[PDB]
């Protein structure tokens, strides 16, 4: 109620305005492949690890997905994580191939099968000991460390 007239008439807020449930600001809008959309631009705290934070977001979004209204799905545009996993998982492969090659390469040069089994057990032991040394020195496994091992 805003005011009362001389005769007793009343002026309500709806008589002078247009109430509607809008947004807090209208500056920003987004569209995904043409159709309307919204979204969250997640940044990363200083010092956090980028791979197990994305896992936490993905496991949180799995918790509020059953209660979505009718027909509301989430999509994942720009996302810098899967490249990291693929590249690391790429370097590792070549390393495991090299052991077979040496176990064959050396087999080719020494034709005894019994004696070609020693370096094939020597190289994995040192490879696995390096990881433990890193876990004692407080490092992580990254592009640089895996390339240093290859």
């Amino acid at each position: 109620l805003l005011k009362v007239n001389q005769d007793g008439s009343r002026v309500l807020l709806r008589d002078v305005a247009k109430i509607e449930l809008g947004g807090e600001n209208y500056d920003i809008i987004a569209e995904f492949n043409g159709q309307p959309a919204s979204g969250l631009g997640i940044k990363l705290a200083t010092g956090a690890n980028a791979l197990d934070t994305a896992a936490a977001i993905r496991a949180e979004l799995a918790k509020m997905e059953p209660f979505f209204p009718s027909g509301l799905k989430i999509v994942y545009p720009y996302d810098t994580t899967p490249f990291v996993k693929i590249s690391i998982h790429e370097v590792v492969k070549t390393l495991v191939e090299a052991i077979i090659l040496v176990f064959l390469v050396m087999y080719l040069f020494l034709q005894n099968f019994r004696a070609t089994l020693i370096p094939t057990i020597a190289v994995p032991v040192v490879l696995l000991g390096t990881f433990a040394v890193l876990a004692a020195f407080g490092f992580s496994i990254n592009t640089l460390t895996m390339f240093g091992m290859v």
Binding site: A30, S38, G39, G41, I42, M64, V75
Partner: protein
């Protein structure tokens, strides 16, 4: 809200920025102030400082300036985060059926799934690409003149 660059600078940027003194391990500081009415001050600390202690010191110097900012800045709420700079990942929410517009989806995201992602460990800043609801009232100058109101 509703302030230009000169107003925002004079009343907020300089007042905040004359109090950022005596912070350990600081390299430089740079700020923006644009006609949307938003301030953005960044303080860059040396390589190897403790991020959370740096934030504690910055916050300690900021709480000395809060009594000097305008009521409209305080009501909105200022913030201090140690986020990075580049989006870790962006999620998106589309409506396949076609029941909701941009405003409805932005409201759903903000109201139901923005707070749970901001409390997940490792997430420094969350940008929402849209806007949440708010009871918006649109006044009519002709009606206000007619009924002798303001």
């Amino acid at each position: 809200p509703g302030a230009d660059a000169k107003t925002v600078q004079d009343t907020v940027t300089q007042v905040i920025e004359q109090n950022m003194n005596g912070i350990d391990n600081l390299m430089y500081m740079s700020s923006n102030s644009d006609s949307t009415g938003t301030v953005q001050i960044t303080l860059t600390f040396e390589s190897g400082t403790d991020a959370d202690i740096a934030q504690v010191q910055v916050q300690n110097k900021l709480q000395l300036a809060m009594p000097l900012l305008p009521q409209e800045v305080q009501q909105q709420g200022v913030s201090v985060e140690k986020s990075s700079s580049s989006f870790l990942m962006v999620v998106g929410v589309i409506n396949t059926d076609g029941t909701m517009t941009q405003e409805d989806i932005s409201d759903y995201v903000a109201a139901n799934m923005k707070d749970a992602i901001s409390r997940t460990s490792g997430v420094g800043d969350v940008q929402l690409f849209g806007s949440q609801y708010a009871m918006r009232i649109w006044m009519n100058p002709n009606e206000l003149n007619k009924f002798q109101l303001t």
